[PDB]
RNA sequence: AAUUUAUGAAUAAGCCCCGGCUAAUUACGUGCCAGCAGCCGCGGUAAUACGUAAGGGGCGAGCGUUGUUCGGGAUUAUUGGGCGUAAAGGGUGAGUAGGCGGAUAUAUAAGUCUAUGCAUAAAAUACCACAGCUCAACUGUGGACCUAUGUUGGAAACUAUAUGUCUAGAGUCUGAUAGAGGAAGUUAGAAUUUCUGGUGUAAGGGUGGAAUCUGUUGAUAUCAGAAAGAAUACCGGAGGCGAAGGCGAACUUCUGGGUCAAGACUGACGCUGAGUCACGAAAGCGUAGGGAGCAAACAGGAUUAGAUACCCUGGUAGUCUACGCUGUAAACGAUGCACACUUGGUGUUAACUAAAAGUUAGUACCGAAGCUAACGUGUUAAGUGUGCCGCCUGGGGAGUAUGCUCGCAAGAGUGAAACUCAAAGGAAUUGACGGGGGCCCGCACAAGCGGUGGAGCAUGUGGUUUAAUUCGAUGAUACGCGAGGAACCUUACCAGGGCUUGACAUAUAUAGGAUAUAGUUAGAGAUAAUUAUUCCCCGUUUGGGGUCUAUAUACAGGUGCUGCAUGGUUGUCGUCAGCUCGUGCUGUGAGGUGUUGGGUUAAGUCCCGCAACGAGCGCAACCCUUGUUAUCUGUUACCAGCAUGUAAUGGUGGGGACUCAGAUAAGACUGCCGGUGAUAAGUCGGAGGAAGGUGAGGAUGACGUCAAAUCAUCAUGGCCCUUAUGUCCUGGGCUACACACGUGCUACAAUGGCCUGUACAAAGCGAAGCGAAACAGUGAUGUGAAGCAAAACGCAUAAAGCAGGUCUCAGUCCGGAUUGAAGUCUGAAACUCGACUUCAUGAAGUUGGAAUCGCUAGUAAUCGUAUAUCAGAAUGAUACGGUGAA
């Protein structure tokens, strides 16, 4: 069980947390729990109209008002009908926490210059039984062509229903996991099938 | 037969197959059972291969199976295969029959060719047209294609027949010449053994290490003499000869073969060769000798569980000679013989030439083209051609059984079938492995310091038994592990009691509060009945917006099975230095090169060269602590020079000096110097410097392996239960024992125990929490509350240490397990089953067998402190400092 989470390598470096705020001991647990509330909330409401996010981030500036920001690169479909599935956020978020809820939505320009996208991509595709060979090859060469200097890509799980469990792994370009002043995103997705669940992970070097 | 009307879709399809071969896939049931199958092979919980349905393919009044023949099989190869290593060259030669064979002239015309003359090859059938049955099958009339024999007339090259000619093939003669060629008869020396005679004494001999054995009856060693047997160092080899086997001291006699040439003669007299004959290493057999050394069988001594062996000491056949048999070998160049041809390089033998220099005939290595499945072969073909002989047709059974021939015998030659398998085999590639080789690394060894295994307890597992002692983890990589806390909860187990839209959700329509706060009734509690009470709030209320009752559902639920259906996460080889790709090149191919070379490093680190050129994941670097300095800031921190509070406290007024804290920077990069190294990469010292060659530590763990661990954290396919395996509570249990193993603690005592006084830390923690000063108490602790959301106060006066007294090698003033009595704290509760204290009780234990673990410097070793889980409870785990080596 090797290869440490390249983001928890990357924190305090490069990288920075993905809930900005700081509370003292009295208020720190359960601040934090709210936020994994609205999170969980959030990501159960839209994946039920099976919606891929690339990231659920968090702004709490005073300990009563807090900013959440939905990152994606379809904003318009994840805003629904004219922002009434974001007040449909707010409201249900409001109906278990006591704080106020201001969501807005962070548009993301390069598609393909994400890796979580590229997992959530992956992921749906080997969800309707395309073959995982052909999708694979298809992603990479197309994010690798839009300007990433590199790009790796491994799936595993039962790969076209066999019995028999592998994993399939692609890869170009420049990958340095171990450097630390690199600029790695990494992304996680999975994938649940007829036949069992698939796991993507999407490494992309910047 | 055929023809014309009358009635009407009326009278009418099945079989095999669907994994590849082989045209045709999905869904259920089965779970290495049932079964399929021509071959390979399918079925162990998701079967396109089994069984049934749905589809699809093939053929059709037929469709499949079995039996038999041919074809695919060039797998009996005339057309059209082989024999170095896959099955296959005879052990070798001389030759009979047979087959084949230089140049050229003439004749014959058997072969061959032609006029596809001429006939004969009955008919049908077979081939091509044309016809008649409604067509076809079927039937009929003509026309031929082969090739088989006979015969007529021609052609003559080739084979054949008969008679000649030639010389270039092959022989004879002449000359020259090399040689362990063979047989017979003589001779020689070294060495060894035995015997005899001297000198001389206690060992000799032998092995990895010993012993048997030899020797005080004179060994071994040494000197002299005598005798016998066998074998021929040096010459002596990338030699020589012979058909092969084989042949090496010297000489003679007898005798076989080869090579060269103008150097004449014969004139095809040749090649190969079934039977047959001759020879044929070593072993063996018969007769008669000989017997030194060596040495099957055999004996003894060792190694070993055993040693009918390897090793040692002895030792009979045999080894040797003469004659007569046997006729087998990895008898090999694993390559039959002969001839005509087909680039070279480097040696060597003989001859011709005075010799070089070349040629010829041999004999070795490398190698172009070609050949070869590859290895390799390559003018001494395994290359291009042919003559003749021998031999092969999957493996096992089997070179067996039986028969025959030969032999004194042992055996040799010839040589099956039944049955059974779907492979056997050749060469080569990539890995792995070696009690193979070479070069390196690691507390791997070595050199050291402490342990484990022995004892007391703590802790885990197995075994064992209970109503249950819930499970998972099981070599390294499980076993003080999941567990960073089992008195209830935890908790998955057990004995009991309740609940069934459920302990909890979301959404569908009812109809008025939820549970509420505090108690009652019974209860072990859960529970139900209850009492206080309501549809509340936004609106000025009804209608409304939502809210729960309490109902009916969609639904929930599961620590139940499968880690071999999985994701995710993790261990491990291993922080070992490796693992691959793009293009190019190379091999028929699996692949190889890059990444095989020489140096070098901790490293596929770097340098050079090399059909490789580049790149990626790794290594390193970038990161975080610690190690020096500079600026910025001095509270809650710090205190130097001041005053000063009697303390204890920088405590107070004061002060930025210092430490310190934390931001921003500098600094160490083989940078520089010397030597060495291929002008290199690198490497050993030196200077500067807090830090030098990665400064020290941590983080960071490549492709993959072990179907390695986890469904029991979560997620998850399939299966399974649905008043149940779900769920609420009471108690028990996870803490049970004749036992075995693993991890720790405390000791066994003098680098120590006990008593008294005194000194020096760091890192952490505090909100229902830290809790001080003091007092009570021997003590665990109790009352109290200061201060503090804290570098502000508290935990907290650290312990080894040091300065004194005591103990005297004693199971002890060592050891503190075990039990008895009385207490402390936690919480509702601690009997099974908590920690701690006081008093008594004082066991095992004398440094621990085989075996085994940790560690290279602030490290082992030891002494305390803090934290996580936590109401309470650590010898475990995490972290911190003190002393500090070999």
């Known amino acids: 069980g090797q290869k440490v989470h390249p983001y928890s390598l990357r924190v305090k470096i490069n990288k920075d947390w993905k809930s ?3 509370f003292d001991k009295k208020l720190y647990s359960a601040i934090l729990h709210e936020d994994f509330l609205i999170r969980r909330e959030i990501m159960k409401f839209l994946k039920g109209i099976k919606f891929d996010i690339s990231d659920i981030e968090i702004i709490r500036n005073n300990p009563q008002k807090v900013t959440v920001v939905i990152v ?9 009908l ?3 599935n974001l007040e449909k ?11 106020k809820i201001s969501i807005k939505i962070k548009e993301v320009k390069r598609p393909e210059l994400d890796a979580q996208i590229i997992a959530n991509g992956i992921a749906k ?23 990433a200097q590199g790009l790796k890509i491994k799936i595993a799980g039962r790969l076209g229903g066999a019995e028999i469990a592998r994993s399939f792994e692609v890869k170009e370009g420049r990958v340095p996991l171990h450097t630390l002043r690199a600029n790695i995103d990494y ?4 994938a649940q099938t007829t036949y069992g669940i698939i796991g993507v992970k999407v490494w992309l070097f910047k």
């Open 20 to 22: 900005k705020w700081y």
């Open 72 to 80: 994606t690169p379809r904003p318009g479909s994840v805003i629904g």
């Open 82 to 84: 004219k922002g009434s």
């Open 89 to 99: 956020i707010g409201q249900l978020l409001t109906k278990k926490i006591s704080k």
């Open 125 to 147: 595709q080997v969800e309707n039984r395309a073959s995982y060979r052909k999708v694979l090859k298809s992603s990479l060469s197309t994010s690798m062509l839009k300007g």
């Open 187 to 190: 992304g996680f997705s999975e």
